[PDB]
């Protein structure tokens, strides 16, 4: 008569709140986070961090992922960064560009770092006008 959930799934290099709980009620929620990493680059958390026990005795969402994501330094010839200044680019890092005078944009002015450490959309070019 009352919807219950078996504990949320465990994840590689991560953990979740209420890990000492075996029986979960209705609407009971849990938040994931990543472990500290051995290397110089920390783990990024991919997906929703918080899931709850809703209808059908299932968890609202699939458990997130904890892995190292690191895009390469984005370089735009005859252009400049106007946002996202930094040396390191992890998951969801966003960079905006703006072409120098006498130059126009060929591609998105805004790029984001993928879960496969690739810029999405690709790094734009600044073209001679």
């Amino acid at each position: 008569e009352k919807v219950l959930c078996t504990p949320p799934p465990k994840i590689k290099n991560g953990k979740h709140t209420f890990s000492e709980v075996e029986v979960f009620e209705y609407l009971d929620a849990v938040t994931y986070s990543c472990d500290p990493a051995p290397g110089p680059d920390p783990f990024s958390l991919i997906g929703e961090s918080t899931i709850y026990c809703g209808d059908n005795s299932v968890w609202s969402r699939a458990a997130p992922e904890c892995k190292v994501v690191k895009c390469r330094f984005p370089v735009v010839e005859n252009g400049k960064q106007i946002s996202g200044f930094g040396k390191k680019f992890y998951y969801k890092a966003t960079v905006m560009f703006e072409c120098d005078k006498g130059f126009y944009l060929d591609g998105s002015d805004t790029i984001v770092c993928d879960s496969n450490s690739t810029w999405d959309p690709p790094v734009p070019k600044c073209l001679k006008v």
Binding site: T17, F18, L27, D28, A29, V30, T31, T50, Y52, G54, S60, I82, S83, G84, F85, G86, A93, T94, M96, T110
Partner: protein, 639 residues
């Protein structure tokens, strides 16, 4: 020569719809606009990005709406940079951020519980517009020492704003005031609370009401304090019995019982009368000077026992002010700035000593007895006065004029208003005139725009821009056209349910020199809107009379509300409230919470144009350099 401007709230909240008003004054053709919100000072995140176009069809006025996502404390203020690019020209402004994401309201089924019983409670999860939202919430139960004994994380997603919960109270437990404390997990620093009492009790069979003939005691009243005791069974019948009544004095947190005021009196047909004599009151204290009691309060304790000796009920009436006047005057609704030469509107708020609004009380400006008026249902009276075109401050003194009273018992109060400072002493002003009656949704408020400038430039002003702040956000923005010579224009403002419980109307115009420089001129007014629900909810009898009903009998309940709404219910024995009537949920308490969180700080006007914007809760920024000063303070400034 085109001037581009942006307007946003003074304080931006997380996960709440925010609007940014965009204007291109004196612009030709289409003006593309890109609006971006970044984190300050690193600009690591694109918090928002929206596009729009300013067209002659929209009179080069538009907006964008944006939302700031959940952040990432030490309590240090956070900031964002809001940025707008009109064609090539960038206008930017750093803005303060509030970490609040909405409200949580908590309802318990009862106010008091015995050990062994179960607390049934509900958490309502709404945003800043009081609309239901689905989010993750953390809930703590706390004992009377402030230690958490139970802790849960719950999602309210797909629950239409209602989180049903329970907690079992152990048989062995500490008595006293327990607490329920909840917070949105994205905004952990705003905790919402309610209390419930745990005690070993049995339900009373009747209720006792202790009420003084006046809601205060006048220190020169030789009749003393007269009190009426009323006893009545929970089922409606009057009580026969005996009452024990004793009085006391409150001085700060110090209570001083008056043993000599203890009287035993008959309760006949559910009524009794008892008096605290003036002599007893004065002999009960060491201070010879009677006037020293002024500022303190009296309390009354009444214990009624049935003739059968089967039940006993205690009730207390406290906070009865010892006063010299039945009234107090407040200027908390009046602007503290005026425009020299133009009418100044005084909102005088008169209250009874307990703090409730006084009704139909004559008030008058001292020195201009001609200028008088009568306070209304909300305790407000409006007094319009004519000002000289000098920089000399307005000192205003108001007195009450209740003819039933003596002069010594009239209330009095003084305030000061400073002149609004024009740009480069140009003597250019804007004045908003408005009606102040009980204002309700569905009606239309006529806003009067009265211009005051030099005839050499008056034709340049072809419109006013107006903005409506409500519940801490920009509700609506618009334009009011003006033809040359129209020194007064009217705006028919439609008051919808979105204006509850109040709003601010800021208006401004701008023009060029007149010595080549851009001048911005502003004014504002604050308007009260009659408290209710946005919709409606009523519970009554689906009968057909058949009252009074009988134990065990079926009855029909008529529930009239708004379509699609989810209604939650509870039935409580009145004896419970005879025991404890605190921490209950009402609509007025909700509106109170909302009004506390208001980001506007004054009743209106301002020191100058920037003051007018900021005091109303707004930023203003132009491409020509005119802008509001930085606000760094979540709270409104203090006296």
């Amino acid at each position: 020569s085109p001037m581009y401007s942006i307007i946003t709230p003074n304080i931006l909240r997380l996960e709440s719809e925010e609007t940014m008003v965009l204007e291109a004054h004196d612009a030709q053709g289409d003006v593309p606009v890109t609006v971006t919100v970044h984190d300050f000072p690193g600009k690591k995140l694109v918090l928002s990005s929206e596009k729009t176009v300013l067209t002659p069809a929209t009179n080069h006025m538009g907006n964008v709406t944006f939302t700031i996502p959940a952040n990432r404390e030490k309590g240090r203020n956070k900031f964002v940079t809001v940025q707008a690019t009109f064609g090539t020209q960038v206008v930017e402004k750093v803005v303060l951020v509030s970490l609040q994401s909405g409200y949580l309201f908590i309802q318990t089924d009862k106010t008091i519980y015995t050990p062994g019983s179960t607390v049934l409670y509900r958490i309502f999860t709404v945003n800043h517009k009081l609309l239901p939202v689905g989010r993750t919430v953390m809930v703590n139960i706390e004992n009377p020492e402030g230690i958490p004994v139970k802790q849960d994380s719950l999602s309210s997603q797909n629950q239409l704003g209602v989180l049903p919960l329970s907690w079992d109270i152990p048989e062995l437990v500490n008595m006293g005031q327990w607490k329920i404390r909840a917070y949105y997990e994205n905004s952990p620093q705003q905790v919402f609370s309610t209390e419930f009492e745990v005690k070993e009790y049995v339900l009373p069979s009747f209720e006792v009401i202790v009420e003084p003939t006046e809601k205060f005691y006048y220190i020169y009243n030789e009749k003393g304090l007269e009190v009426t005791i009323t006893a009545r069974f929970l089922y409606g019948k009057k009580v026969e019995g005996t009452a024990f009544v004793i009085f006391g004095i409150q001085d700060g947190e110090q209570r001083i019982s008056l043993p000599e005021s203890l009287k035993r009196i008959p309760i006949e047909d559910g009524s009794g009368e008892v008096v605290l004599s003036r002599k007893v009151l004065l002999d009960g204290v060491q201070n010879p000077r009677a006037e020293d009691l002024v500022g303190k309060s009296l309390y009354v304790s009444a214990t009624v026992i049935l003739h059968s000796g089967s039940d006993m009920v205690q009730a207390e009436r406290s906070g009865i002010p010892i006063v010299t006047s039945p009234y107090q005057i407040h200027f908390t609704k009046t602007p503290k700035y005026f425009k020299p030469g133009m009418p100044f509107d005084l909102m005088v708020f008169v209250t009874n000593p307990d703090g409730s609004p006084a009704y139909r009380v004559p008030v008058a400006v001292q020195g201009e007895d001609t200028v008088q008026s009568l306070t209304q249902g909300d305790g407000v009276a409006k007094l319009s006065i004519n000002t000289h075109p000098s920089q000399k401050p307005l000192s205003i003194t108001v007195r009450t004029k209740k003819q039933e009273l003596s002069e010594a018992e009239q209330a009095t109060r003084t305030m000061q208003a400073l002149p609004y400072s024009t740009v480069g002493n140009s003597n250019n002003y804007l004045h908003l005139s408005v009606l102040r009656t009980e204002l309700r949704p569905g009606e239309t408020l006529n806003v009067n725009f009265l211009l005051r400038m030099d005839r050499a430039h008056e034709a340049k002003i072809r419109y006013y821009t107006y903005l409506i702040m409500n519940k801490g956000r920009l509700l609506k923005a618009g334009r009011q056209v003006r033809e040359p010579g129209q020194d007064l224009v009217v705006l028919p403002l439609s008051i919808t349910t979105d204006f509850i419980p109040s709003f601010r109307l800021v208006a401004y115009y701008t023009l060029i020199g007149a010595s080549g420089q851009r001048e911005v001129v502003a004014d504002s007014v604050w308007v009260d809107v009659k408290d209710s629900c946005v919709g409606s909810l009523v519970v009554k009898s689906g009968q057909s009379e058949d009252r009074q009903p009988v134990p065990g009998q079926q009855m029909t309940l008529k529930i009239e509300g708004d379509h699609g709404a989810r209604v939650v219910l509870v039935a409580v024995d009145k004896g419970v409230f005879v025991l404890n009537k605190k921490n209950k949920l009402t609509q007025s308490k909700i509106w109170d919470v909302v009004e506390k969180a208001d980001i506007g700080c004054t009743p209106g006007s301002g020191k100058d144009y920037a003051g007018v914007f900021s005091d109303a809760g707004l930023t203003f920024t132009s491409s020509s350099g005119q802008q509001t000063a930085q606000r760094a303070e979540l709270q409104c400034p203090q006296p």
